[PDB]
Amino acid sequence: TNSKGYRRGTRDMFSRPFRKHGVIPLSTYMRVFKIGDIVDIKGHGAVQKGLPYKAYHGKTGRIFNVTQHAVGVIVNKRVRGKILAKRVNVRIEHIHHSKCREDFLRRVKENERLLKEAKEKGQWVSLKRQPEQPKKAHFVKKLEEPIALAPIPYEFIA
Amino acid sequence: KQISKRVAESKRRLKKAAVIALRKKENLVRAEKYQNEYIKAEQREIKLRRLAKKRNQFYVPAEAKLAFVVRIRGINKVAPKVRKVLQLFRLRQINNGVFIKLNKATINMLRIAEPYITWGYPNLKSVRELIYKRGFVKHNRQRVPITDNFVIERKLRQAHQIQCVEDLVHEIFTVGPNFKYASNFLWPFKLNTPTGGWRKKANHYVNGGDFGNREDQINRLLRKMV
Amino acid sequence: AKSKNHTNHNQNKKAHRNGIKRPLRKRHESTLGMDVKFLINQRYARKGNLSREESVKRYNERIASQKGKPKPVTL
Amino acid sequence: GLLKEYEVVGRKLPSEKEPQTPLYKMRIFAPDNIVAKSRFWYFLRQLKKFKKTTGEIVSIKQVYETSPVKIKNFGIWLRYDSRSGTHNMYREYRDLTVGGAVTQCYRDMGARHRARAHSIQIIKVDSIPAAKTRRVHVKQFHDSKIKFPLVQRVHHKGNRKLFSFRKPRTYFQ
Amino acid sequence: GIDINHKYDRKVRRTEPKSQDVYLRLLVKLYRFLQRRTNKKFNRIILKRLFMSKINRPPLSLQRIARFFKAANQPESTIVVVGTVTDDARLLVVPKLTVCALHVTQTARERILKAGGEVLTFDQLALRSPTGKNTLLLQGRRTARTACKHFGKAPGVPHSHTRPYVRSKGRKFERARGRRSSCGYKK
RNA sequence: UUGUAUACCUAUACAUUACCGCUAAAGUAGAUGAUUUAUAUUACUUGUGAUAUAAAUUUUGAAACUUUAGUGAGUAGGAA
RNA sequence: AUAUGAAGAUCAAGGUUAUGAUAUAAAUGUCCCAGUGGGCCACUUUUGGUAAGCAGAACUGGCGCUGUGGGAUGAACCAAA
RNA sequence: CAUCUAGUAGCUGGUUCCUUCCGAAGUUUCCCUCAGGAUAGCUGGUGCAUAUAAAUAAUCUUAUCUGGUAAAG
RNA sequence: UGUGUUUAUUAUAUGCACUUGUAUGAUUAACAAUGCGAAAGAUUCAGGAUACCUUCGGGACCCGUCUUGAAACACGGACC
C-alpha cells in the first residue's frame, strides 16, 4: 500500500537510455516555444529541477505560457472518470515538439497547392483522405518459370 | 378567395400528375441503364478470366466492396469495445442486417466485432430482395415502409440523385458516391430467422460454421431470412 | 470482521455512464498564472489600438515618408 | 462434409521494391472454398513468410477427379498430434475419388486415434498401383477372383409394420 | 432484445403552462394557432415563453427597455416582454415606446402613457403583428437572482466566489478558519 | 465412445399481424347564408368558373379529436 | 538599439470543410435529490498459503436487482433478457 | 413504589392502495472512524438553451509521441 | 462523344359517356345452409374458473425478513 510519493515507480521512467548519459546536447535550450504549440512530455532524469510528476510523462499538451526557463503546458489527465485539463509548469529540457500535426500541416500545404492547379481541370480535386480500399482486379502473369513450386506441410521430426 | 381556389388547385393537380408521369418515364429509362450495367459487368469478368487462361496468366478478380452484415447473437454478456462497434454499425438486435462498405477502417471493426456477426458479399438478387421485401426507410426519425417511389424520392432527390428503388439498389450494389446516404437512409434490415436455422453460432464459419465472413454464402442465408 | 477493502470493481461501468467526458473546447482560455509582464501593458498593446484602419493606413505612408525602416533593423 | 480438393495459389502482393513475387501453390482438402483459403494460409505460414494481410490469394480452383469410375488405392502421408504426440502415419484407403479417400481418412483417424481434425496435416496423397501398397486390409481386395458371401441388410425400425406378422428371418434357404 | 432507452428519451420541456390563469391559457390558444398556422419562430418563442415560470420570465426595467430601443433603423417597433416591465426611477425622460407585456407595472404604465406610447397585451400584438414584424423581443437577465449567486460552493479553486448560506452578517459569522490566512488557511 | 450425414423437436429470442401502454413526432379549429358533395341556369374554350334552386356532416371535456413511428426485465430508490 | 520580434487589433486572397462509420437528440443548470458506502461468482493475470466451497488484488463480463429455454438437480454456466 | 420519562439506542423488529415510467450502490477521501457518518461517485425529478451544417460528441483507419511486461539475454 | 451504317426493343401521341375490374388509400369481402328476437313466457347458435363440484395433462417448495446467498435444520407467524 503505496504509490505516495513523488518519484516512486520512476526507476525506469526517469532513467537515462543506454549510453545516452552525461552532458545534455546544446540544441535542447535552442528550441523556440510559442504560445499554443503542441508539445510532448518525456522527462529528463539528469535535470532534477522542473521535472513533471509521473502522470504526465508520455502525455501531450499545448503550450499556454512561456517564461524564462519553462513552458506552462496544458495537459489532459483522466481523473476517473472525467478529464480535467491540467496546467503543468515544466522546464524546457523535459519538453519536446510534437511531430503529430506537422504532417497534417503538410497536407493543408497540399490542399491548397492541388486546389490551385485545379482551377484548370476542375475535378476531382480529391481533398479527402481515403482508407485502404480493396485492391483491384489485376492480371498476375506468371512467366516466372511455371508453377509448382508447390509447398506441402512438413516440419516436425527431432 | 375560393373563387380562385379551383383556379389554383386544378393546375396544381394537372402539374402534379405531369411530374409523376414524367418520373414514371425516367425510372424506366433510368433502371434500364442500370440493368444493362450489371449485364456488361458479368460478361466482362467471364471475358477476362477466359482471356487470362489463354494468355497463360491469372486473372485475380476484384476484392469486394459491400459487406452485408448480420447480427446473430445476444445483447447479454458483451464487451464494451465490441458493444460499441455494434452501435456504430446499427446492429442492436439479433437478425439485424446492414450494408457496409469494405474499406480498411471498417474491416478492423468487423474483426473486433467478429463473434457476434456474420458477413459476406451480396449478389444483385440479394440487394433487390432485401430492399423489395424487407426494405424500410427513415423519414424524420420514423420508420416508413416503402410502398411507392415517393418515399425514396422525397428525401434523396434534391440533394442526391435517387428517386426510384433501382436507384437505391444501384448506389448500394455498385458502391457509388452517395453510398453513405443510400445505406443510412434505410433502417436496419429486421430479418426473420433462417429456415433450417443455424450451424453453431459460436464457432467461426471456417471452423464448423457461423460468425465471421461466410463471403459468398451470405447469399444462401439471405434466402432463408428474406 | 475485517471484511473486504479496496476494489476497482464496477468503477469504470460507474464512470462511463455519464460519460468519460472531454472538458470542452474554448476560443477564450484564461490568462491567469501566465507571465504577468507579458500581459500587463499588452493590456495596453490593445488599448493603443484607438483606431486600426482609418488613421493606420495613413501610417503606411507616414513612415514611408522616411522610406520605412528597411535597412537598419538587420542587427 | 465430403472434402473435395483445390489448388490455392498465393503471392505476397508486390510492393514496388519487389516486382513479380514467386507464386506458390498447394493441394488443399477442404469442405468448401472459404475454408480452403484459411488452410492455404495455415500451411504456408509454416513454409514462407507473408501472412494475410500481407499476401494475396490468386486462383483457387476445384479439381474434379480425372477418372471417377476407375478403382484405385490411395496412400495418404499424414502427420497428426496425439495427446503426447506429434507423429507421422502412412495410411492406405481404397476408393474411386481422391477427395473421397482423404475423407475416408479423416473419419478413420477420428475412430482409431481420437484425432479431432484440426490436428491432421496431410503431406501427400497418391494413387499407388498394387504391389506397392502394403497395408493388409487393402491387399485383401487385390485379387481377382474375390468371392465373400454376404450377410448385410436394412431391417426397418419400426417398419412399414412395427408389430410384424411374419418374422424377418436373416437367412433363407 | 434491443438497446437502450434511459433518458432523455422522455424530454423534460413544458408543453402547457402550470398555470390555472384563464387569461394566460387563452393566449396559449391563440399562439398555438399562430405558431402552427404561421410558422414563424417569433410565435414559437412567445408560445414557449408563455409556458414558463416566474423564474425564466424575469422582470425588465423601464430604463432597460428605453435603452434597447436605441436599436438603429427601428423607430417604429414594439417592445415585446413575455414577462413584466418594471418602473425605473433612475430614468429621467421616458421615450415614446410601444410595449407588449403580460404585466406592465402601474407606474410604468403612466410613464409610458404620458410620454405617450402604447401598452399592449399579447392579443393586441397578435392583430398588429401576427408574424412579429416591427418587434423587439426582449427578456430579463435570468441569473440576476440572488439565489443564483449561491450556486455553488466548494472552496479550493480561484473561481469560487459563491456565497455561503449564513444567518447573519458580521464577524462571528463564518469569517475565521478558511476565510482568513491567520486562521487555518485561506480557502 | 470418436469422426460425420440428412430429417425433425424445442424458448418469454427473432419475423409478421391484432390489442394495451409509454415515448417521440405531425395535423385540425372563417359555423354570418364557413366548408364541402351530388344535381339543376348562364358567361362561354372544347371545358371550367360564377349566380340561383335541390340532402346531409361538423359548437372535436382547444385538459379535445385525428395521423404516423418506435418501444416494454427490475430490488433499494425517485416520480406521474 | 527593430515602436521586422512576440502577442494583439484590422483590412486583403483562398472551388468541393479535408479518414471511416454513428447520431440511442445531444448541451447546461438546479434539488448536492433518494438509496448506497457487508458484496459475491467466473475466464485471464496474480500474491500469500501444504491446501481450501480459504485470504488478497488487476481486467472485463455476470448474480445481487431477473423471469424464461438448456445443464436431471442448482445465484453465477450455455442460450436469451 | 411513583415521578423526572414517550430518558437514550451508530442496534434488532415492524412500517398499511393499484398501475405506469426511469433505475442504483457495496467505491474515494476523511473521522476514537471499522454494525456508523460526512464526502465524491452512481440515481431520479425538474427544467432551460439549441422541431411545417463546416453543431459537435464517441469505438476503428492514418500521423505522431509514450511504455520495459511477455519473449529475449 | 459524334455521325451514319444499321439491325432489334421500350416510351409518349387513348378523348367523351358508362360499368358488380387496384390502393378500398393497416382493404376481406361475397354465395349458400341453420335458426323467426312469441301479446305475458319457448327455442336456435355461440360464449362464460360466477363460487364451486367432476375429469385430465402440464406447471407448481412458504410467506414476511436481515443477507453475497432462504424452501431452509436462520428468526416471526395456530386462527379471526
Curated annotation (Swiss-Prot), chain B:
Any Pfam family: Ribosomal_L30_N
Function: Binds to G-rich structures in 28S rRNA and in mRNAs. Plays a regulatory role in the translation apparatus; inhibits cell-free translation of mRNAs.
Cited CDD domains: Ribosomal_L7_archeal_euk
Protein name, entry field: Large ribosomal subunit protein uL30
GO cellular component: cytosolic large ribosomal subunit; cytosolic ribosome
Organism: Drosophila melanogaster
Transmembrane segments: none
Domain of life per record: Eukaryota
Family matches, as Gene3D superfamilies: 1.10.15.30, Ribosomal protein L30, ferredoxin-like fold domain
Keyword field: Ribonucleoprotein, Ribosomal protein, RNA-binding
Name of the gene this protein is made from: RpL7
Family: Belongs to the universal ribosomal protein uL30 family.
InterPro entries named among the record's database cross-references: Ribo_uL30_ferredoxin-like_sf (IPR036919), Ribosomal_uL30 (IPR039699), Ribosomal_uL30_CS (IPR018038), Ribosomal_uL30_euk (IPR005998), Ribosomal_uL30_euk_arc (IPR035808), Ribosomal_uL30_ferredoxin-like (IPR016082), Ribosomal_uL30_N_euk (IPR012988)
GO biological process: cytoplasmic translation; maturation of LSU-rRNA from tricistronic rRNA transcript (SSU-rRNA, 5.8S rRNA, LSU-rRNA); pupariation
Gene Ontology MF term list: RNA binding; structural constituent of ribosome
UniProtKB/Swiss-Prot annotation, chain C:
Amino acid composition bias (Basic residues), ranges on this chain: 1-28
Gene Ontology annotations of biological process type: cytoplasmic translation
Keyword Repeat: no
Region of interest (Disordered), residue spans: 1-32, 46-75
Protein keywords: Phosphoprotein, Ribonucleoprotein, Ribosomal protein
InterPro entries per UniProt: Ribosomal_eL29
GO MF, one example: structural constituent of ribosome
Residues the record lists as Phosphoserine modifications: 30
Key word Protein transport present: no
One cellular component term from this protein's GO annotations in UniProt: cytosolic large ribosomal subunit
Coiled-coil ranges from the UniProt annotation: none
Highest taxon of the lineage: Eukaryota
Regions crossing the membrane: none
Compositional bias annotation for Basic and acidic residues: 50-61
Family: Belongs to the eukaryotic ribosomal protein eL29 family.
Protein name: Large ribosomal subunit protein eL29
From Swiss-Prot, chain D:
Name of a matching Pfam family: Ribosomal_L18A
Keyword Nucleotidyltransferase: no
Entry's Gene Ontology cellular component terms: cytosolic large ribosomal subunit; cytosolic ribosome
Annotated GO MF terms: structural constituent of ribosome
Keyword check for Nucleotidyltransferase: no
A biological process from GO: cytoplasmic translation
Positions in coiled-coil regions: none
Superkingdom of source: Eukaryota
UniProt-listed PANTHER family: 60S RIBOSOMAL PROTEIN L18A (PTHR10052)
Similarity annotation: Belongs to the eukaryotic ribosomal protein eL20 family.
Protein name: Large ribosomal subunit protein eL20
Native source organism of the sequence: Drosophila melanogaster
Gene responsible for this protein: RpL18A
From Swiss-Prot, chain E:
GO MF, one annotated term: RNA binding
Predominant location category: cytoplasm
PROSITE patterns named in the record: RIBOSOMAL_L18E
UniProt KW keywords: Cytoplasm, Ribonucleoprotein, Ribosomal protein
A GO BP entry: cytoplasmic translation
One GO term describing the cellular component: cytosolic ribosome
Listed InterPro entries: Ribosomal_eL18, Ribosomal_eL18/eL18-A/B/_CS, Ribosomal_uL15/eL18, Ribosomal_uL15/eL18_sf
Disulfide pairings: none
Keyword Ribonucleoprotein attached: yes
Keyword hit for Nucleotidyltransferase: no
Cellular localization per UniProt: Cytoplasm
Family that this chain belongs to: Belongs to the eukaryotic ribosomal protein eL18 family.
PANTHER family cross-referenced by the UniProt entry: 60S RIBOSOMAL PROTEIN L18 (PTHR10934), LARGE RIBOSOMAL SUBUNIT PROTEIN EL18 (PTHR10934:SF2)
Protein's UniProt name: Large ribosomal subunit protein eL18
Natural source organism: Drosophila melanogaster
Lineage of origin: Eukaryota, Metazoa, Ecdysozoa, Arthropoda, Hexapoda
